């Protein structure tokens, strides 16, 4: 009661304390600054490839190190992986359970993840004498359904679950080495550094927390948004990263400054963004909708610089190669594609 | 095309083999019939091992040649939001209910009624943007229960606006017109209302009945005759 | 994984046989077949191949019309059948294993093989030297040499090495002329460029010594090479 009471004050005063040490530092606004440099052409882009084979929604995919080989997760139990050059198919594999949400591969090539709704990750091994692909272990212990998994080594693994709970895997063992908590809502996206030493994650009560991989203490969280926060992704620099929820609206935040940087958004669209991804010099900003179209956009002059219109349902995935050539993406209507 | 080598071709082959057993196991998937089981809680849900038998748990049974796949999705504890579009395809919604205990008010929270909040759920899931076009049957309780409650307790009238009494087949009835003039839709959506018995075999043939009807009736509406 | 064959035994030019393979541990119908000539005291040499899921079956024009190769894929066996056997058909049989996609490594498992004695355009086969005096603790080259460019616009070059010891079966080095085997030591390296080609080993040991052969894949009609002794 009046401890609890002072306690709040307490808060309200540390969180009055942050709000202006933020205010102190915020002179001088990105758009201001940028308006000197020269606006990009309008870039316009076309299909090439066109995967088929799937025969259920696609509800994620992942982009190989070598950018050239992707595989693709849908729900009628199957795990597709492609060759992006001749449309041909390396592997199919099947799953215990139907029902999944994402699925991640490995740098090195040789392991595959998936899983969702059933609380359960299982890890795949490619590489076998027997000719055939074999799950190595399945990871037991969230309590939610899992959301997004993102291989840090050949031996690490880090996943976000609906119990509002992030957790670190040892493969080897198959125990929890690290928990991450503090998330009122659901967990629904992560994104791994470049250097593999610090993440960040989006939560359903539209906040998004910096965390460390190593002491496994949260160290910054940032807010702005008004409802969940569906995709998370880095700038290529590793100290900024851009967010995008349900309020029709893409935000860029900045790691060294706790600022706000910029807003994505226009009076023509009030419709979702499912998944936003980066380019390989860091100038355009891409993010998928569901009003069954993608949209491009300049990461300096926050204008459309451009439209991709393929799909006749909902864009559930994006992705983009290390080598900054091409751009896949994914779609309710079964389809994959893949534009330059 | 002629410009390949010798691995190529190979590679060709191994691609046509993988497509031609997705697809052939594609085609199988199709002709199995998915549903979706919801329920208050102790409304009866866990009772299926004896009813239809001799994370998300599910359940596998055939009956008069066709193959059935029952979704338990009540143990989730997690935001209905988030992944109620994953079942936009299902057949035939069931929504298990135990209203005999009616009068028997109770919600755990010390405010609510069964009733009421059964009812908030049954609106909640059946007007959703998604599940339109999809069938929900019912299945109420064992009567025998409230044959027994009913009879000492006229607590009946504690529900406002009601003019009978103490008569099964008035309350059977008149809560039956209570769920089925709740939904939104009443003419692109038909909702099946059935009393469970403790026989074993008549908890099955009303589904088989059911589901054969909602097949029949996409059949038409699939082949321009409707 | 084991490869056994079954059939072999002494024959007559009147004569026929069926031979036999079983395949245990690992997934028999998911993986190309080939059988290869071996005369004693002789080079090898490519016989026949059949696809997986029995779908192309090729053959080589000195046993053209004359063999039949069939697969059983429940049983996991394989079959080939003679009708007429020649002078020249004595050789030491052997069934070879591989399988085709991105990045694969074909002709990884030789199989342990049998032997059978039977009673009394195409790529150029050509290499060098035949015998090498060699003392271990130093390096070893070996060239092998063809009448055409192997290299594909895309940017591959099918060129296989692999080593043969006495009393067993060959197994493969390099696959690709580019690329080691799994559980081949690092001292061995592949090199080359459009037809000049070379194997280097780094560092010379007693468990080194053999026989060596180039192959190339870049056309159906496989031509093996020849050998490149090595002495201790």
């Known amino acids: 009661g009046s401890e609890l009471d002072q306690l709040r004050q307490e808060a309200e005063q540390l969180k009055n304390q942050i709000r202006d040490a933020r205010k102190a530092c915020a002179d001088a606004t990105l758009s201001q600054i940028t308006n000197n440099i020269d606006p990009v052409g309008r870039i316009q882009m076309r299909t090439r490839r066109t995967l088929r084979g799937h025969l259920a929604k696609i509800y994620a995919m992942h982009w190989g190190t070598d950018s050239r080989l992707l595989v693709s997760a849908s729900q009628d139990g199957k795990l597709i992986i492609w060759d992006s050059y001749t449309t041909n198919k390396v592997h199919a594999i099947p799953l215990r359970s139907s029902w999944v949400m994402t699925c991640a591969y490995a740098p090195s090539g040789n392991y595959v993840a998936c899983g969702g709704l059933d609380n359960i990750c299982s890890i795949y091994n490619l590489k076998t004498r027997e000719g055939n692909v074999r799950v190595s272990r399945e990871l037991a212990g969230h309590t939610g359904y899992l959301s997004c998994c993102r291989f840090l080594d050949d031996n690490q693994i880090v996943t976000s679950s609906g119990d509002t709970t992030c957790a670190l895997w040892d493969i080897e063992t198959g125990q929890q080495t690290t928990t991450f908590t503090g998330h009122t809502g659901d967990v629904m996206s992560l994104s791994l550094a470049p250097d593999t030493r610090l993440f960040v994650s989006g939560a359903c009560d539209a906040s998004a927390k910096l965390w460390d991989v190593r002491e496994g203490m949260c160290r910054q969280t940032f807010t702005g948004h008004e409802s969940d926060i569906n995709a998370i992704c880095f700038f290529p620099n590793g100290n900024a990263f851009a967010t995008g929820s349900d309020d029709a609206t893409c935000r860029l935040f900045d790691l060294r400054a706790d600022q706000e940087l910029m807003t994505y958004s226009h009076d023509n669209i009030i419709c979702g963004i499912t998944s936003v991804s980066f380019s390989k010099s860091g100038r355009l900003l891409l993010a998928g909708y569901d009003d069954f179209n993608c949209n491009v956009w300049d990461a300096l002059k926050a204008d459309r610089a451009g439209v991709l219109a393929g799909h006749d349902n909902r864009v559930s995935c994006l992705g983009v190669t290390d080598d900054g050539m091409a751009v896949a993406t994914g779609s309710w209507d079964s389809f994959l594609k893949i534009w330059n | 095309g002629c410009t390949l080598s010798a691995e190529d071709k190979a590679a060709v082959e191994r691609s046509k083999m993988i497509d031609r057993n997705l697809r052939e196991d594609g085609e199988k998937a199709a002709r199995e019939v998915k549903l979706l089981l919801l329920g208050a809680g102790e409304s009866g849900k866990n009772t299926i091992v004896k009813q239809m038998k001799i994370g998300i748990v599910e359940t596998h049974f055939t009956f008069k040649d066709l193959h059935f796949k029952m979704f338990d999705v009540g143990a989730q504890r997690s935001e209905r939001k988030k992944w109620i579009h994953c079942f936009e395809g299902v057949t035939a919604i069931i929504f298990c209910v135990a209203l005999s205990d009616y009068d028997l008010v109770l919600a755990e929270d010390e405010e609510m009624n069964r009733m009421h909040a059964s009812m908030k759920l049954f609106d909640s899931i059946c007007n959703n943007k998604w599940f339109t076009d999809t069938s929900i049957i019912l299945f109420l309780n064992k009567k025998d229960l409230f044959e027994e409650k009913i009879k000492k307790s006229p607590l009946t009238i504690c529900y406002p606006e009601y003019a009978g009494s103490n008569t099964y087949e008035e309350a059977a009835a008149y809560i039956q017109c209570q769920f089925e003039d709740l939904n939104k839709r009443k003419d692109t959506k038909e909702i099946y209302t059935h009393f469970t018995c403790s026989t074993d075999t008549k908890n099955v043939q009303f589904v088989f009945d059911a589901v054969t009807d909602v097949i029949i009736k996409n059949n038409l509406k699939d082949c321009g005759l409707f | 994984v084991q490869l056994v064959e079954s059939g072999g035994g002494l024959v007559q030019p009147g004569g026929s046989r069926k031979l036999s393979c079983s395949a245990s541990?690992?997934?028999?119908?998911?993986?190309?077949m080939h059988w290869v000539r071996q005369a004693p005291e002789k080079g090898l040499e490519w016989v026949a191949y059949?696809?997986?899921?029995?779908?192309?079956?090729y053959y080589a024009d000195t046993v053209k019309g004359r063999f039949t190769i069939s697969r059983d894929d429940p049983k996991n066996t394989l079959f080939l059948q003679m009708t007429s056997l020649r002078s020249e058909d004595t050789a030491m049989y052997y069934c070879?294993?591989?399988?085709?996609?991105?990045?694969?490594?074909?002709?990884?498992?030789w199989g342990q093989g049998t032997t059978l004695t039977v009673s009394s355009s195409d790529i150029v086969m050509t290499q060098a030297t035949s015998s090498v005096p060699v003392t271990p603790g130093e390096s070893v080259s070996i060239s092998c040499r063809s009448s055409?460019?192997?290299?594909?616009?895309?940017?591959?070059?099918?060129l296989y090495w692999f080593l043969q010891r006495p009393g067993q079966s060959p197994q493969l080095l390099i696959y690709?002329?580019?690329n080691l085997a799994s559980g081949v030591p690092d001292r061995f390296s592949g090199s080359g460029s459009g037809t000049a080609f070379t194997l280097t080993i780094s560092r010379l040991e007693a468990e080194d010594v053999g026989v060596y052969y180039c192959?190339?894949?870049?056309?159906?009609?496989?031509?093996f090479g020849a050998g490149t002794k090595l002495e201790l």
């Open positions: 070879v294993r591989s399988i085709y996609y991105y990045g694969s490594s074909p002709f990884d498992f």
């Open positions: 541990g690992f997934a028999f119908s998911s993986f190309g």
């Open positions: 059949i696809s997986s899921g029995s779908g192309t079956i």
């Open positions: 055409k460019s192997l290299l594909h616009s895309n940017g591959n070059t099918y």
């Open positions: 690709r002329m580019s």
């Open positions: 192959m190339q894949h870049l056309e159906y009609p496989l031509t």
